[PDB]
Amino acid sequence: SALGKLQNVVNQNAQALNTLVKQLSSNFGAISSVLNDILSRLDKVEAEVQ
Amino acid sequence: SFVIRGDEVRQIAPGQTGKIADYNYKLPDDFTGCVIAWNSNNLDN
């Protein structure tokens, strides 16, 4: 419990990188968060909007 | 300029799909232009 200042640096680095990777799974309003779904399911004029 | 069946006119666009767009007349994805078409039934042939 004394080393909490150093352990917080490790925890913050890990927490930030996990959050950056987790955000790949989000839709942001697109029909899927998986890019190969959009590219395989839609014609180009629709796919580029997604 | 050319002639087609009336149902095919809908294919004449950037990124459209169908037999004419595949095998006869295709526009680029960045097309700058106008498409004009009319029911010339009196050509029938």
Q: Name residues whose C-beta falls within 8 Å of residue B19's C-beta, 6 or more positions apart in sequence.
A: B8, B11
Q: How far apart are CA A44 and CA B7, in angstroms?
A: 22
Locus of tokens 């150093």: A6
DSSP letter for A49, please.
T
Contacts of B13 in chain A (CB under 8 A): 45
Q: Name residues whose C-beta falls within 8 Å of residue A45's C-beta, 6 or more positions apart in sequence.
A: B13, B14, B15
Do residues A38 and A47 touch, judged by C-beta distance below 8 A? yes
Contacts of A45 in chain B (CB under 8 A): 13-15
Phi/psi for B10 (5° steps) reads -60, -20
Q: CA-nearest residue of chain A to B13?
A: A45
**Smallest Cα distance from A37 to chain B, Å:** 18
Q: Name residues whose C-beta falls within 8 Å of residue A33's C-beta, 6 or more positions apart in sequence.
A: A24, A25, A26, A27
Q: Give the method of determination.
A: cryo-EM
Instruction: Report CA Rg, chain A.
Output: 18
